[PDB]
Protein: Cysteine desulfurase SufS
Amino acid sequence: MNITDIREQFPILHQQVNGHDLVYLDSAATSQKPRAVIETLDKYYNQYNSNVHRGVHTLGTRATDGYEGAREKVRKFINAKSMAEIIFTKGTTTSLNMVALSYARANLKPGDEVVITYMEHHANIIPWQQAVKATGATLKYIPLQEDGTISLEDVRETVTSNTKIVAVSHVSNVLGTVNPIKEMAKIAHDNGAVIVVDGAQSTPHMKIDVQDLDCDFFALSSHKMCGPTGVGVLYGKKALLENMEPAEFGGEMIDFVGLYESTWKELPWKFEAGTPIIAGAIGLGAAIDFLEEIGLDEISRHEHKLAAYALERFRQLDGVTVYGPEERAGLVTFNLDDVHPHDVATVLDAEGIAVRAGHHCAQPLMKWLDVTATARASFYLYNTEEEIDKLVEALQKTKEYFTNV
Amino acid sequence: MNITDIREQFPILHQQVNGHDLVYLDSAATSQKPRAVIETLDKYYNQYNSNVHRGVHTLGTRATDGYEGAREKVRKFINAKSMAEIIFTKGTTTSLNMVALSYARANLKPGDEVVITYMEHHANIIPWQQAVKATGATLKYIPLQEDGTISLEDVRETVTSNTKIVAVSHVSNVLGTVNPIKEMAKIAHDNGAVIVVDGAQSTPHMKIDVQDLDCDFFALSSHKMCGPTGVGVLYGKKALLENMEPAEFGGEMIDFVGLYESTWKELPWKFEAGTPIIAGAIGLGAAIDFLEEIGLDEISRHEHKLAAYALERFRQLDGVTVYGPEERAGLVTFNLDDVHPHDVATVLDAEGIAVRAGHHCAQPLMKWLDVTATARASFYLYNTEEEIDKLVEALQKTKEYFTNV
Ligand SMILES: Cc1ncc(COP(=O)(O)O)c(CN[C@@H](CS)C(=O)O)c1O
Ligand SMILES: Cc1ncc(COP(=O)(O)O)c(CN[C@@H](CS)C(=O)O)c1O
Structure:
């Protein structure tokens, strides 16, 4: 894996910001796209754009073939059994909302429990809040260890025989934690529940295997894995998706429509109302081709190299708190003593370094850490150790400057 | 309005299909994009792609500015009062589903009536079916005149004092009918109801004025107005959108998130959960710039010219049934005597002519016409009278061939 060759594929990286070279370290918010994906979108809009499953002319069949081939690329990418288990959505948030509306709100009686965690993104929290409010069920949280990890014993103690849904993220966007999804799925099934994996932060950086994890649902976003914005994937076990009513209604997802009642299509189109995100899904397929061409194991090893390097360099700075475990994904969430994270992000952007500051759409975790805000630098397959050097040097300069104030 | 200059902007038009030049006549399914829109997507992914409202670095603010400027372009394009009334959705289907889930299912008691029409797209039918099923309300239909138009007297007789929602399309994707949306809104308000306009087929071809129409909701799709796929707009009156609960939950749309309850953001972000369709919405803004540069009145006049020409040329063929009124939009829905529409579409694609065959996601209308299937040729701002000549000549050749069989 030559990283110069990879960086040469992303045109947005080769620019300057406020005089300095661009050091993009906000991939956990969104990733950049290689020429393959952008040129896939270009070829679609330039050559064979047409509506899919709706008119059998040449361009129509070309577009339909591209769309469904992207669906099968997704099926192979995450090792799903059937592409009937692969549903194209607007993103991870929309997929989680779909599971919460079509599975949760239809399979929860009072006394049933929905268990999430303290590190969950807001997308994996509020849908469950609203579902248990609509059904009168109970929302429970799995506590976290002092290093930000989850122990399986805490899981077993939190999920009971009255639990219907375990909702948990694969990788934490704040802590960098890689949660034990496999054993958690075993635990949830032993108690008669299903498991919903928020895989928004894991899918771009590590290989996914729905079979090995035995997850009942899995949600991912394309803009974080070098794919176009506005498209994501919901994976559900075919047996579960068959008994779930559609979250949306309209064309493409119906079989027969009478004046008052209608019947639905087979999977997966039962859950894809209206004209789908054609170009977006085909570009996501291009992104999957690109990632598999580089190799997801290689990307994971590069990420772990960057993360260990960043943790060591951060420990070389004093006056910096880093949140989360040692074994982690490629992101570092931190704060500087006596400097607010927004000012850190501002002065880092003055140096052309792009980081995120705030709660990262995880306020319960922020209060769990007893912090109000937080800075974060996230790495992907185009980031170098030289960029982490620039980051830690600018952090030392920020500390020296604010101390001199 | 020079149409050669316009056709030069769409690269997909200059290709051949099965030996013949491409004659794209399926714009009612999806439209083609000019270089402005594709190059807007290219510039976004090449220069300033970043997550919006989430990290204040330079690329982040550039992307946020582009996204919100596209929102304001949409507000100007349809004359909305405030961009708090402009919500970016996945498409017309998703916007109609949002109105049906967040307004209908929360403001319908048994005895309330929801009135639609016989010509409505499936997207403007099944959401109301499911809403009245969830609430126990009543679904009613406004009958159609023998020429496929709606009379205001039939409206007044159908909508009563127990009606909460009139749901009607602005332009019919099958009939070409332009419904009297303004007077229908007056009628609905006189009976204490709101009005939901399915403007999927009107927005690309004619000027929209939410103020003049006084519609309570308006749904549009971007892929039909030269914009990217996967993005559309829901317009709701600010006073109505303020009292509607969000259809989706997650990041970006919340203010405070506790363990069990959360509070929402202001409009419009209250209805935009998760990472939004950034590139898609910015490309839709580019499409709006392009359309306003040509002029929507000019596009409407070109459409009426093409439609009158096509109606006359079709009447020059015998053995052809055309469905709908004389005054119409730029689409012709038809059938040939003793030839099935799928075969018509196949032999037209052999000549490189792209038409749609089937029910066009409007089965109730198909049975209302006492037909099972149907062919359709739709025109947009890049279609010429020479292409309609090719269409009618290929139709005559198809008639001669199938008669010789
Ligand atoms: C673990 C996890 N789960 C869900 C989401 C949200 O998915 P969407 O693609 O935005 O719909 C995110 C992304 N949250 C972004 C932007 S709020 C971040 O900067 O971390 C996530 O990290
Ligand atoms: C009046 C009207 N209302 C809603 C829709 C569907 O909107 P979407 O953008 O697909 O979500 C359509 C488009 N129906 C397409 C493809 S099914 C046609 O070929 O006619 C429509 O014409």
Notes: The pocket of C6P (ligand 1) is lined by residues A 28-29, 91-93, 121, 123-124, 169, 173, 198, 200-201, 221, 356, 360-361; B 51, 54, 251, 274-275 (CB under 6 Å).
